[PDB]
Design an enzyme around this catalytic site. Structure first.
Site: not given
Lengths: 48, 442
Positions: B57-58, B134
């Site tokens: 996703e990143h 994160e």
């Protein structure tokens, strides 16, 4: 000296069959309930 | 009203000889939003494969080979479209929102990601340390960690138990490859859905997808979607104490049915009845939701919320609250008590409101374009098609008291729940206790 004799032993009989039956039952129950702890697991996770 | 529902534009859907299913809803709206919703997630990850879906996703945005970073973004920014997305445990998506005057342009973009991501080995080694940071942030969001831990123990041992984010050790060692090994493995048309809402004309969409999704399935495999390994629910607890924290969180739940199940309705209505509280509200007078009321009167919690988070074949029907180190107990008690009441002596007058309350979220669940696409994106993927508000309506416009009782009890009464609690919880009683809190001394 003790007319109860028979009545008293017969009784003893049953009394013994209840222990036999009851104590385990509650033993399970005691273990059943403690398993939550017996089973359990610790761990120390500070951040560093 | 009912007429308002009925006059609501049907949703168009048609799959490709490829596999993708292309659906969407049309309105007047200049704007819109469109996205590909993959049947991908963490659940689909392994012991050494866990994380990818994320680490992915990143990098799903940092470019493709056709158009590297600086350009994609520049092409996206420059046109004013918003390309956002996520990745859960059994659901991942990537939606954009432009002016509908970009269907064909947005669509292409979409395809160019779900299929060709730069995965620049140099881009990765950065996003690596980015996530690892994160993640360290996701961490003090007790509001969440409390849920993963819930999953962690609720579904201990199986695939769900693994958190969408994945262990630090994997994110610290995922290979340029493993990511691709993930992409090529799950990112396939049969499990992906192209959905959209706004001013778009289905056909134009189709053709564009049917145009930029030039996928071709040889084998019978490619055309078949694997069903997932069943996850064992495990009534248990997991306590991550720390009186060092402002307060403790508690989340307990029973196994959920799974999207399919028709009862998720009546059940949904259930959660409508006790709802949620949160000190900002304005109601010690609140609607039935005693949990709410009582939460006020006796200042039980900072906030509590009911949830029926469900998945393909399983679920997590419970409740989560946040409270001072000190009132944790009284809360559970009062709360957990409600479940009982709920499925032992719930009334019509109650369900009446419940319903309408759902029918309000039911509607506002679809508020705008992005959200609508979500359902469409979802609906198909997990349900098979699209559930119209006209349908949901009946579904839950026909749930009587006796039905809620029959349901909740069916999934709550004398069931072994899973509790999760981080923070100063010394006050939360052992399991057996919150366990025998499942049956009402009727």
């Amino acid at each position: 000296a003790e007319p109860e004799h028979d009545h008293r032993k017969r009784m003893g009989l049953k009394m013994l069959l209840m222990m036999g039956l009851l104590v385990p039952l509650v033993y399970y129950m005691k273990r059943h309930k403690w398993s939550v702890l017996k089973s359990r697991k610790l761990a120390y996770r500070p951040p560093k | 009203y009912a007429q308002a529902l009925q006059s609501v534009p049907e949703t168009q859907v048609s799959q490709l000889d490829n596999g993708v299913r292309v659906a969407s809803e049309q309105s007047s709206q200049p704007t819109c939003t469109v996205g590909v919703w993959i049947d991908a997630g963490s659940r689909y990850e392994s012991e050494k494969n866990n994380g990818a879906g994320y680490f992915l996703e990143h990098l799903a945005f940092k470019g493709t080979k056709n158009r590297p970073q600086n350009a994609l973004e520049k092409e996206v920014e420059s046109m004013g479209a918003h390309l956002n997305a996520y990745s859960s445990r059994e659901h991942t998506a990537y939606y954009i929102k432009a002016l509908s005057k970009d269907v064909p342009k947005a669509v292409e973009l979409l395809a160019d990601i779900v299929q060709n991501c730069s995965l620049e080995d140099s881009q990765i080694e950065k996003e690596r340390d980015v996530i690892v940071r994160e993640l360290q942030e996701n961490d003090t969001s007790m509001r969440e960690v409390v849920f993963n831990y819930l999953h962690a123990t609720a579904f201990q041992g199986t695939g769900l138990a693994q958190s969408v984010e994945g262990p630090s050790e994997n994110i610290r060692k995922l290979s340029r490859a493993d990511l691709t090994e993930y992409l090529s493995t799950h990112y396939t048309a049969p499990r992906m859905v192209l959905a959209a809402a706004g001013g778009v004309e289905h056909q134009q969409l189709l053709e564009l997808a049917q145009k930029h999704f030039g996928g071709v399935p040889f084998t019978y495999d490619d055309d078949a979607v694997p069903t997932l390994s069943k996850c064992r629910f495990t009534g248990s607890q997991i306590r991550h104490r720390e009186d060092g924290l402002p307060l403790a969180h508690v989340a307990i739940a029973v196994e959920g049915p799974g999207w399919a199940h028709p009862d998720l309705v009546a059940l949904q209505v259930a959660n409508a009845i006790i709802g949620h509280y949160d000190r900002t509200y304005g109601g010690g007078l609140h609607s039935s939701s005693p949990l709410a009321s009582i939460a006020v009167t006796n200042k039980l919690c900072q906030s509590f919320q009911t949830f029926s988070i469900c998945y393909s074949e399983t679920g997590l029907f419970g409740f989560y609250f946040v409270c001072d180190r000190m009132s944790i107990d009284d809360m559970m008690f009062v709360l957990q008590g409600q479940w009982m009441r709920l499925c032992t002596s719930i009334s019509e007058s109650e369900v009446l409101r419940g319903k309408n309350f759902l029918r309000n979220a039911l509607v506002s669940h679809l508020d705008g374009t992005t959200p609508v696409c979500e359902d469409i994106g979802r609906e198909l993927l997990t349900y098979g098609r699209r559930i119209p508000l006209e349908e949901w309506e009946e579904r839950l416009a026909e749930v009587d008291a006796r039905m809620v009782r029959e349901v909740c009890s069916k999934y709550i009464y004398d069931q072994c729940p899973a509790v999760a609690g981080p923070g100063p919880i010394e006050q939360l009683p052992d399991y057996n206790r919150i366990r025998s809190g499942m049956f009402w001394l009727r």
